[PDB]
Amino acid sequence: SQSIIAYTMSLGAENSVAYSNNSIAIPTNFTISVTTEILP
Amino acid sequence: VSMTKTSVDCTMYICGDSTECSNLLLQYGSFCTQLNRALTGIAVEQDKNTQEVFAQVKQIYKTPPIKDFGGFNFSQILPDPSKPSKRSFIEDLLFNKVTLADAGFIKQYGDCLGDIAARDLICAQKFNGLTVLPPLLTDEMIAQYTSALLAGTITSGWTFGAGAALQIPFAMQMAYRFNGIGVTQNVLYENQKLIANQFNSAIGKIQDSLSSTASALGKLQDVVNQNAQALNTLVKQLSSNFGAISSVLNDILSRLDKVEAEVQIDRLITGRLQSLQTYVTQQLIRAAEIRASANLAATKMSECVLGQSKRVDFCGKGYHLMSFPQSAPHGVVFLHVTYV
Amino acid sequence: IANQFNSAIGKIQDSLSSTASALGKLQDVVNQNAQALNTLVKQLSSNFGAISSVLNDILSRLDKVEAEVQIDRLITGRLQSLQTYVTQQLIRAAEIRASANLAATKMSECVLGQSKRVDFCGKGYHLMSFPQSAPHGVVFLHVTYVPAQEKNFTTAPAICHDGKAHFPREGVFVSNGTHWFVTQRNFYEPQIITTDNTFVSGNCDVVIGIVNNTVYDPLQPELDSFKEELDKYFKNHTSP
Amino acid sequence: TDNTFVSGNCDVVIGIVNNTVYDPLQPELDSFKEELDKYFKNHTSP
Ligand SMILES: *[C@@H]1O[C@H](CO)[C@@H](O[C@@H]2O[C@H](CO)[C@@H](O[C@H]3O[C@H](CO)[C@@H](O)[C@H](O)[C@@H]3O)[C@H](O)[C@H]2NC(C)=O)[C@H](O)[C@H]1NC(C)=O
Ligand SMILES: *[C@@H]1O[C@H](CO)[C@@H](O[C@@H]2O[C@H](CO)[C@@H](O[C@H]3O[C@H](CO)[C@@H](O)[C@H](O)[C@@H]3O)[C@H](O)[C@H]2NC(C)=O)[C@H](O)[C@H]1NC(C)=O
Ligand SMILES: *[C@@H]1O[C@H](CO)[C@@H](O[C@@H]2O[C@H](CO)[C@@H](O[C@H]3O[C@H](CO)[C@@H](O)[C@H](O)[C@@H]3O)[C@H](O)[C@H]2NC(C)=O)[C@H](O)[C@H]1NC(C)=O
Ligand SMILES: *[C@@H]1O[C@H](CO)[C@@H](O[C@@H]2O[C@H](CO)[C@@H](O[C@H]3O[C@H](CO)[C@@H](O)[C@H](O)[C@@H]3O)[C@H](O)[C@H]2NC(C)=O)[C@H](O)[C@H]1NC(C)=O
Ligand SMILES: *[C@@H]1O[C@H](CO)[C@@H](O[C@@H]2O[C@H](CO)[C@@H](O[C@H]3O[C@H](CO)[C@@H](O)[C@H](O)[C@@H]3O)[C@H](O)[C@H]2NC(C)=O)[C@H](O)[C@H]1NC(C)=O
Ligand SMILES: *[C@@H]1O[C@H](CO[C@@H]2O[C@@H](C)[C@@H](O)[C@@H](O)[C@@H]2O)[C@@H](O[C@@H]2O[C@H](CO)[C@@H](O)[C@H](O)[C@H]2NC(C)=O)[C@H](O)[C@H]1NC(C)=O
Ligand SMILES: *[C@@H]1O[C@H](CO)[C@@H](O)[C@H](O)[C@H]1NC(C)=O
Ligand SMILES: *[C@@H]1O[C@H](CO)[C@@H](O)[C@H](O)[C@H]1NC(C)=O
Ligand SMILES: *[C@@H]1O[C@H](CO)[C@@H](O)[C@H](O)[C@H]1NC(C)=O
Ligand SMILES: *[C@@H]1O[C@H](CO)[C@@H](O)[C@H](O)[C@H]1NC(C)=O
């Protein structure tokens, strides 16, 4: 039931940011993330 | 940010469908595979370069239908829906300045034979085994990435760079910028109509200048010109005898027997093989200049668009407030905003 | 913060115990240098138009003047195979040098410092990085603060109070819908708006979107409760 | 005294100049001394 498929690639998920002339979003919490960078 | 992807059939360039020349070319071993590997490595890197610069957003951000940005007017740099590609007004200006040669988007025989075949260099390249390959990202996809970078910036400031896009009013984002250059935020709010009118007028001068001067995108035109001049040089090296009785491989095979033709064909193989080794070395050297330029453009995207830079002269002249990316043919334009 | 760091370092260890191709940037360098040497050894199989690739089979079969014309063909192609290998290696050495110069800059700016440069030291706001050695490479484990659980607030650029416009010293004004606070901008931590949290500039006429609220002076009740201390002494001193 | 910080005496700094530095708590307590004084003077009357 597998096959090769061909498609136009997605660039990402779309997002309308909730902009208003007097609305702000402020983070109530944080995460600590560790990410790897590899260099020759 | 990139250059045209090229592929060559080393056998159709050197030997042009002679079986006698093809049997002689096998005696040189791996060189035609090496030349194809090197050009394939250059071509994959043009897509890599474009992904490093433009694909810096998680999500394709949209601007709100209510454009209340505190009197700042982004209409000339935001998408225009009236067009098949959703580019900005300034991105259409930029796409008119730089003249391309072959996008890779199918050449289909009847568009290339007959009356057209004389008045064209691209059909003379293609009839000699040389082909341009299309980019992985279309110009519409680069414009969607640039739309998302600009919508993320004007709706959320630097916050879409570090995590989720957090909305903030645009004049409050601009007051943050003012604190970041050592100016107190009341200097923005007490001068907001002036700061907005000066921004709106300075963006109007970008539109006017790009509508008026010819050579401003000469940095991108130089790249297209070099890649075209290198391919025209490579096609013209087929006129060279390299000491053979003719450069025309069929005239050698029409007039000479099996053993006389082999000595003349080896002279053409030697010079045409050296012409490809020269072209591929020059293109490998260029590809490193374009990479270094794309790595700089990706760093300017991160540090000038997704942030506010404290680095001097990194994001224009003055104290950096913010930058806006615009897509251009094989390049990027940053519109850098500075407090002077 | 310690448990989140300890768990994130645990996920580095788990991924490096689970996925294969993550070090593909370093494996590609080893693969390219090995493939370039295998290509150079294979070019010894090529005749370059001579009667054989094997130099001894030319010298075992041909006299001095016949052999020298065949050997010239092998010298020509083998010398060109080295000039190609060395040019390709000189072009690759410049890519590795640019990558080492970047890694030295990340060692200085991400390990020996804290970077304000966006996306130079991972994704998020940089805290610190840890170097780890790898075959022909370096790994940076970049630690970043990522803001996580955002809430919407109403906001204003200024507060109007005594006919004077007030601005945050550090922070931003926010409302939950009924009350106004100052918060630091990168973490929700709301405080009563005071003459210590804020600075004055001008009157309320100039600022687009200024809102009315009280701005507390903490010296006021410190002298208002003192105003009642005087009255209780004065009223007790009515007795003589 | 809200715009500025003190460090040391005037002997060390090359090019230091004399000026008044305002303490905004000073008149907020002097007008509170005149508030005490009028209370004391009025309460001499009984
Ligand atoms: C900020 O986000 C934190 C996550 O990054 C979050 O910490 C998590 O809190 C929950 C409880 O609310 C914990 O869940 C555990 O709670 C008890 C055991 O202590 C059990 O009953 C549960 O089944 C579960 O095991 C998480 O363990 C905890 N995560 C960490 C890393 O400690 C905070 O609560 C958030 N704080 C605020 C103020 O929003
Ligand atoms: C943001 O800046 C824009 C560029 O200056 C500006 O767009 C321009 O707006 C004017 C007035 O609406 C248009 O002028 C034309 O208006 C109608 C169109 O049917 C005609 O009857 C007029 O004769 C005149 O030609 C411009 O055409 C328009 N330019 C573009 C490129 O769209 C916006 O108005 C500014 N936005 C705000 C909120 O001020
Ligand atoms: C916006 O934030 C306000 C401050 O946090 C909040 O007001 C506070 O509401 C609580 C109840 O939820 C009150 O709590 C007190 O209630 C009585 C007061 O007599 C006492 O018996 C209790 O022990 C307790 O102290 C606070 O007094 C009140 N604070 C103020 C300054 O009014 C609002 O409710 C929040 N509004 C929204 C829309 O979330
Ligand atoms: C924020 O607080 C301000 C101070 O309390 C308040 O200003 C006051 O606004 C009203 C209505 O505009 C004015 O009322 C008077 O207007 C004229 C005379 O000025 C008369 O015709 C009216 O009958 C009435 O007497 C006040 O004069 C004005 N005060 C000052 C010092 O300017 C704002 O309205 C408040 N704004 C919001 C949105 O809450
Ligand atoms: C800045 O203000 C200072 C304080 O008012 C002032 O210092 C004073 O300077 C004078 C002149 O040098 C001194 O005058 C006395 O000098 C000796 C004794 O010290 C006597 O022989 C003199 O007759 C005279 O009484 C003050 O003693 C000195 N005060 C202090 C505390 O050091 C500066 O001169 C002012 N500088 C400028 C440039 O305005
Ligand atoms: C912040 O608010 C936006 C939109 O404004 C809100 O609209 C109401 C729904 C109500 O929440 C009001 O108090 C605000 O003024 C929220 O955006 C909506 O998100 C949902 C999905 O969660 C989506 O279905 C809606 O279409 C969105 N509406 C718009 C106009 O964008 C957003 O979720 C809030 N963000 C946070 C961090 O709480
Ligand atoms: C914000 O937009 C509303 C309309 O949604 C408008 O009535 C109001 O005057 C605007 N306020 C500011 C501060 O721009
Ligand atoms: C005055 O008040 C004090 C307490 O404040 C009390 O100890 C004292 O007895 C009172 N004297 C008179 C005369 O009221
Ligand atoms: C500045 O220069 C003047 C001479 O022009 C000199 O008299 C004075 O002492 C100097 N002051 C400082 C602060 O160096
Ligand atoms: C003076 O003191 C009396 C009480 O003895 C009080 O009634 C009056 O209000 C005071 N007036 C002033 C001006 O202090």
Task: Note down, in words, how this protein is organized.
Chain C: This is Spike protein S2'. Chain C: It comes from Severe acute respiratory syndrome coronavirus 2 (2019-nCoV). This is part of a larger assembly, with 4 copies of chain A. Chain A has 40 residues and is an all-beta fold. Chain A contains no helices and 3 strands. At the B-C interface, helix 3, helix 8, helix 9 and helix 14 of B face helix 4, strand 2, strand 3, strand 5 and strand 9 of C. The complex binds a molecule of 3 linked components (NAG-NAG-MAN) (5 copies), a molecule of 3 linked components (NAG-NAG-FUC) and 2-acetamido-2-deoxy-beta-D-glucopyranose (4 copies). A molecule of 3 linked components (NAG-NAG-MAN) sits at the interface of chains A and C. One 2-acetamido-2-deoxy-beta-D-glucopyranose (NAG) binds next to helix 1 of chain D.
